[PDB]
Write an enzyme that holds these catalytic residues in place. Structure first.
Site, PDB file in Angstrom:
ATOM      1  N   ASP A  53      12.347   8.021   9.878  1.00 55.77           N
ATOM      2  CA  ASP A  53      11.662   9.268   9.540  1.00 55.77           C
ATOM      3  C   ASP A  53      11.608  10.307  10.660  1.00 55.77           C
ATOM      4  O   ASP A  53      10.556  10.898  10.929  1.00 55.77           O
ATOM      5  CB  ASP A  53      10.239   8.962   9.058  1.00 55.77           C
ATOM      6  CG  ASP A  53      10.214   8.056   7.839  1.00 55.77           C
ATOM      7  OD1 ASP A  53      11.224   7.997   7.101  1.00 55.77           O
ATOM      8  OD2 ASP A  53       9.172   7.405   7.609  1.00 55.77           O
ATOM      9  N   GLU A 328       1.603   8.840  -0.607  1.00 52.04           N
ATOM     10  CA  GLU A 328       2.501   9.664  -1.406  1.00 52.04           C
ATOM     11  C   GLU A 328       2.094   9.480  -2.857  1.00 52.04           C
ATOM     12  O   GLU A 328       1.710   8.382  -3.257  1.00 52.04           O
ATOM     13  CB  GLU A 328       3.935   9.196  -1.210  1.00 52.04           C
ATOM     14  CG  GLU A 328       4.333   9.128   0.246  1.00 52.04           C
ATOM     15  CD  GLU A 328       5.529   8.232   0.455  1.00 52.04           C
ATOM     16  OE1 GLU A 328       5.668   7.268  -0.322  1.00 52.04           O
ATOM     17  OE2 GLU A 328       6.312   8.481   1.393  1.00 52.04           O
ATOM     18  N   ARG A 344       0.544   5.996  -4.297  1.00 48.62           N
ATOM     19  CA  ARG A 344       1.046   4.825  -3.588  1.00 48.62           C
ATOM     20  C   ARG A 344      -0.136   4.249  -2.812  1.00 48.62           C
ATOM     21  O   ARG A 344      -0.835   4.980  -2.103  1.00 48.62           O
ATOM     22  CB  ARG A 344       2.161   5.236  -2.625  1.00 48.62           C
ATOM     23  CG  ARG A 344       2.493   4.195  -1.570  1.00 48.62           C
ATOM     24  CD  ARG A 344       3.679   4.641  -0.720  1.00 48.62           C
ATOM     25  NE  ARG A 344       3.895   3.772   0.433  1.00 48.62           N
ATOM     26  CZ  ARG A 344       4.940   3.861   1.250  1.00 48.62           C
ATOM     27  NH1 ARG A 344       5.872   4.779   1.036  1.00 48.62           N
ATOM     28  NH2 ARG A 344       5.052   3.036   2.286  1.00 48.62           N
TER      29      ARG A 344
END
Length: 474
Positions: A53, A328, A344
């Site tokens: 990421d 998320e 999530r």
């Protein structure tokens, strides 16, 4: 009858840790959007150096004008240039990561909202101490620039001219209106007509200035069905509270409310962390929205704000509770006007929050659906109508781990409650992030993450399925 197309690869990753045919090792974070023209826009993170990421990551899309059969060449929305002098290139570039796509049904403008971090390890390199990123002056908000050896905040004003902390124009200027392909020149720092460096660089700098090492939200838009995009607009100041550490999107495809008092409102899933527990116990879902067709944005409240956890209340800005986190998410509006947020989480099953006011506040009880497993990975869900009946289709990994992609079908009752009817497998093996879209005529599409044959995480593929696949047992 039952129909599920073979998978088609839209963004191909390399294999065995090697770069692909275009010198790119990885692709991640799919976003799928069906535009008013019927075009399918597939978005993704173009991660050149590795699958993590951070690093050199561009926001890219591909357009299909034949409902997913064929796709045009990649279109880069935004790709900031690397710091050519960084000691470790793997973490040596300003970063853009995770996008949310959505189109305004009235103006037809298509939006791409995504995260932005100055040079570094992104969300996993968040400084311990806050650095002010903006300064208001005469009702005007300006982005701040820091200079080593000085405590005062410099500012970027009209034409990108850099002003001293005492408010005097300098001979330095920032490229605030980038013109190079992918706007790779955004942030370039000049002294006169001499290019010195970039305000997004944080190490081995060649110029005196850098922005705050924080978390940002950028927005790019297209008025030509995704072919060309505007230069990135920094919307962070309109939605990021002073206590927020990380503020990023819940990747995928946002929505525009279809009915109710807030019809027309554009909703974008996002989540934050606080300075108390950051990524360990404060990840909290919420949405940001726009009632003026994307001109101005506002933050809704967190699902966790004033939430009762184990007998006591918490707030997204002060919590430290791993299990109470929600990260998320994917958002859907029901015909009764309610907004559902599928988040999530870490409970092992599907967690859903409900908002009765267009996404600003959330009801007290977070519903859990044991019928739908959640292995702690992103998911997508969409509203759909079939033979006069209302449903919701949701896709995520079936487990044990991030594997065995599933498409879950739920009937939406008149009170907004959900009844899970079917759970059908759509992709064996590795399966992670995904994005669903209704294509019409009883068909649906999905862009998802999957790997096989030694492929690097991940290759984003596309499949189309119909109602018979959703409701019938194969």
């Amino acid at each position: 009858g039952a129909a599920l197309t073979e998978k088609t690869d839209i963004f191909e990753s390399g294999r065995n840790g090697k770069p692909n045919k275009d010198g790119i090792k990885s692709y991640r974070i799919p976003a799928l959007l069906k535009t008013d023209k019927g075009t399918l826009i597939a978005g993704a993170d173009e991660r050149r150096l590795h699958s993590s990421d951070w690093g050199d990551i561009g926001m890219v899309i591909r357009r299909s004008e034949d409902n997913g059969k064929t796709w045009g060449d990649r279109v880069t929305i935004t790709n900031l240039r690397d710091n050519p002098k960084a000691s470790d290139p793997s973490i040596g570039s300003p970063v853009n990561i995770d996008m949310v796509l959505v189109q305004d049904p009235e103006t037809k403008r298509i939006f791409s909202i995504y995260d932005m971090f100055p040079e570094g390890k992104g969300i996993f390199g968040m400084s311990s101490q806050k650095e002010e990123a903006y300064k208001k002056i005469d009702g005007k908000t300006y982005q701040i620039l820091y200079r080593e050896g000085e405590k005062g905040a410099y500012t970027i004003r009209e034409n990108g001219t850099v002003y001293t902390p005492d408010g005097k124009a300098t001979d330095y200027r920032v490229v605030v209106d980038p013109v190079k392909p992918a706007y790779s020149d955004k942030g370039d720092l000049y002294k006169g007509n001499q290019l010195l460096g970039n305000i997004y660089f944080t190490t081995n700098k060649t110029s005196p200035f850098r922005i705050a090492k924080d978390s940002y939200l950028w927005m790019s838009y297209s008025d030509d069905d995704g072919k060309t995009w505007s230069a990135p607009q920094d919307i962070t100041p309109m939605v990021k509270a002073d206590w927020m550490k990380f503020l990023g999107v819940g990747p995928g495809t946002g929505i525009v409310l279809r009915n109710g008092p807030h019809k027309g409102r554009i909703l974008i899933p996002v989540y934050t962390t606080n300075n108390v527990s950051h990524l360990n116990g404060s990840q909290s879902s919420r949405i940001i929205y726009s009632d003026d067709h994307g001109k101005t944005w506002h933050a809704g409240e967190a699902v966790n704000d004033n939430r009762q956890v184990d007998g006591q209340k918490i707030h997204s800005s002060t919590m430290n509770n791993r299990r109470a986190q929600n990260t998320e998410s994917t958002v859907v509006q029901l015909n009764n006007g309610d907004v559902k947020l599928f988040m999530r989480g870490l409970t092992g099953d599907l967690q859903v929050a409900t908002s009765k006011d267009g996404g600003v506040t959330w009801e007290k009880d977070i519903k859990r659906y044991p019928q739908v497993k959640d292995v702690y990975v992103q998911m997508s869900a969409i509203h759909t109508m079939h033979e006069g009946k209302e449903y919701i289709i949701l896709s995520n990994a079936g487990g044990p781990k991030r594997e065995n992609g599933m498409v879950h079908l739920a009937r939406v009752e008149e009170n907004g409650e959900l009844t899970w009817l079917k759970h059908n497998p759509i992709q064996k093996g590795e399966f992670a992030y995904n994005s669903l879209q209704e294509l019409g005529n009883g068909e649906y599409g999905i862009l998802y993450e999957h790997t096989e044959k030694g492929q690097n995480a991940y290759t984003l593929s596309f499949r189309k399925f119909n109602w018979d696949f959703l409701s019938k047992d194969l």
